[PDB]
Design a protein around this nucleic acid. Sequence first.
RNA 1: GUGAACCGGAUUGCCGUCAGGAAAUUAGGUGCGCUUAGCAGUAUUCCCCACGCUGUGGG
Lengths: 63, 63, 249, 63, 63, 165, 87, 264
Amino acid sequence: MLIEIHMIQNHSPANLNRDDLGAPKTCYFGGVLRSRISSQCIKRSIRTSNDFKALLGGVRTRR
Amino acid sequence: PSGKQNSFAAHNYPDGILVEFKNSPISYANAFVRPVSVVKESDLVEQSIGQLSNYVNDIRLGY
Amino acid sequence: MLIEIHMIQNHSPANLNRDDLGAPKTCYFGGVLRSRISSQCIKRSIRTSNDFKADIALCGVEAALQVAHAISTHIARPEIDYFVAADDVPGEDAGAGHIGESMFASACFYKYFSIDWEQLVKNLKGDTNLAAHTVGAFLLAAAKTNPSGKQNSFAAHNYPDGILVEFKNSPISYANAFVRPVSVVKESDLVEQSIGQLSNYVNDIRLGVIGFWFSPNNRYPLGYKHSKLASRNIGNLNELVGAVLDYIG
Amino acid sequence: PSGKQNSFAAHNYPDGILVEFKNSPISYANAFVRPVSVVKESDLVEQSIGQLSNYVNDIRLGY
Amino acid sequence: VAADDVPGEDAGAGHIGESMFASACFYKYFSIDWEQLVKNLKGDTNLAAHTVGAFLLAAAKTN
Amino acid sequence: NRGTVDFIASLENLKEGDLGILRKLRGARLDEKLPGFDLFSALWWPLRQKNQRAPKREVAWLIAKLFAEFRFEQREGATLPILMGGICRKLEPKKELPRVLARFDQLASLDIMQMEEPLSVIMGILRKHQQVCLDWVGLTDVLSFWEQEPVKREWSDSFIKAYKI
Amino acid sequence: VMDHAACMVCKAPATTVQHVNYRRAGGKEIPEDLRALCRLCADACTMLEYGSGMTTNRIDPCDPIWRERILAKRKEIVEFRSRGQRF
Amino acid sequence: MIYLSRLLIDTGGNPDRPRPGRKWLDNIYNVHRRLSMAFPSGLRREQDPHFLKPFSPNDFQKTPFLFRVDNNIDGNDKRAIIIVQSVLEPDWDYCFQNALDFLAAPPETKEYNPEFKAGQLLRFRLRVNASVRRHIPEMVQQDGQTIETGKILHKRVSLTWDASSTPDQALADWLAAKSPKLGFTLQRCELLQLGWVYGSKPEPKNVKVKEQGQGYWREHKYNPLRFRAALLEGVLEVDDPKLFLKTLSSGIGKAKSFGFGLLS
RNA sequence: GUGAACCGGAUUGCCGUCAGGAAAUUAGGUGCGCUUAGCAGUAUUCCCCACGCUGUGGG
Ligand SMILES: [Mg+2]
């Protein structure tokens, strides 16, 4: 059994994600330019969120 | 996301949650294949929710 | 008698078919480069999962399917990505990961299916009404589960919008509708423009059967005239399944 | 002004005149920022001259 | 309009056009820094007083 | 075309008050002020009954607003990607050329209604470089068909051709 | 004269006819889609249509959601119309 | 049951802006129409409060009633007065609910009941038509050579009075002789206004036919109507307070719909 | 049905982390809308029932 969670978020002028050159991420959805936020950034911010601290129990280290 | 929030403190909150329980997930990306162009009445959030609810209608009756 | 499931399928931005170097696969048609998923990929995606299994005479007498390469209705648009895997343990410097590059494409596809008379009757399995039951499963099982791919990082399972099913017996793909890749004009959708191109091709070729048309809550009509180019502008889940069931027998 | 005076004949001569000589220009139009309302006892020329005298005394004393 | 007086032709006028104007009640704000001014003039107190007083007079009496 | 030329010529006939009220309507649709709609109707109605081809209504309204704001003169051969590009050669390629160049490329991915402000900044730097002539008929009939990509690519290649020369 | 030579929203002697449901702009028009309607409020209909989107959906001054805007536009029509400057 | 009231309309002051009330007063058919869709019904009152519906006069209550358009000065302002009264209660919140430009000040409802007994000096004006059926409708004088062709037509032509007098002692004689029928009298009468009043009424017809039903396809037609006016006053002495109330409920003359009504 | 069948390129990823576009500005001077006017008038008032044929019910 699987759960879907959908959001529609309007944001203030911001740069939450950038590529190597520093531009906000863009995708060509439906033939037009759509602003994109990377999935990994959302996953990381939810990982480091202030309520996951009782459950934050994974480390990704080379040291 | 902890991007340039020190320079753009955009901590706005999700103006929509859609949780639906099923064994075949769906993104409402096709709710906005038509780009949302705002009108003089309402706002971008309401027009986006309106197109999303139109899509929810014909995927809750047509699909 | 032959079943042609001409199907449109838009896709939210995600890579589905990957070559050696990881790009979305591409085809050449109409003097332009268009995005492509391989017919083997979508055909295996029709197998290998139990939701469709609710079929071994159809993808094995060999097998009974003609699945075409997903020709995009427009030009290919491959994009690129840039990921950084964090260190999460404080070292003398920051950043640790592979710092690689991924790549993706959003496209609206088309395909064509073929199930003949004896190619479904001699399929048989064990019944003679199975030659209608399996097809009835297929006409919406082909639009049931988008393949697979990098879904854990690029979540895309956009259901299709406009579905054709024809009972014309002469096997012709309508890919010549997309000889000119679909451009975008502001008053219509990309899927709506593609469906208008398909409709414009439909009004041709008949000059030199029926049109069983699927539009969920008929948001997409096959022609903006009372002289409808399909004359069956309806469709709701298994209503079309049962209508093909008693069209065949 | 001799506009449409063949049909109306409004040759109405003057009620009061304020001719001054000073070193900086002023306009008492701001006296009639309050419109002149007719009282049952006096005519509007006398009333307007009273309002003008009020504001003239204002500017003469307060500047 | 601009009307002609010599009757060299039929009863024409000359140049016609338009003018645009308005009338309003205005709000004006000024701010004179003191120690910044006395640093800019380098210790001339009486000329700074001349500046502030003449500014207070010239903002009011001049249009 | 023999229909847009009359529209541009009638726009050049407009006197100071009419284009003043057109100037005051920047970024505003032709509904919230009655005199603006009246002026647009007077400019836009009588050219459909004399010639069979007319521009789009939104293009006409936007072009009238921009014409009132900037007040150029009509001259053949002075389209946007020639004068643009000609001014790009008068630039330092290190820093300012990408700035002005991105300001120009912003136009190529926008719909007709939202281009009022990017066209405003493009014509503002045109006014800063003292440009008097602009082909309003040429701009209008490349803008009324702005949704087909061949004319956009032709406009861009005109910018390329004017830049390499 | 189906509506007795009268307006419909702001009832008064009628002059012209407006068009609703632009499925077809009309070479052949069925008589259950038009709207015989007076000069000032048809001018307000053209107010609302010419501003914002042009599209194919129309005004239909029957369901009372497009009412306040029509009356306000008619008010500024009454206040600001220059008949000597045409229209 | 007198329901005397007033409807002070907004005459303009700029014949460059559109003037709705001034144009509305020029056609008495539409004046009657405007005054008659007031107090509409309670049949569909609970459905909509916004006056946005396809018009049909059948839903409106068909009670005959009266009005009169006049002009007066209150103390300092000219404003044309409309005086109405009817047997049904006033509900002008729907007739002008989207045509507020027709009005100048919100209308006021009064209550009044008459008592005159006999022979007082406290009466008021009157409006009537000068309409008589013709003694000699002479044989339809046609045109082409200024000739006469037709037979007869009983028409309500205007009153052809004498040629050696003026109508302030001719029409005065007329209603002075008419008064003992209706239960009053005239000791003095001087006319104030006289002339013609015009209008236009549309006629639905049917010529064309429809191929799948009856003849819905059909055309338009207009027709004019004219009346002769008389607005006048008098100091009158009612004969009896038992039959003059019927005259105060019907009016001297019965134009009713077209302006000329009862004594006010 | 065929140098063709039947057939995944799969899973792991924050680009992050520092940034006043600031210093200076009279929107300038020229101009008549204007020549002409009774809101009056009996001798058919468009009608429909309807009178000894001009009173009587209204569109
Ligand atoms: Mg109206």
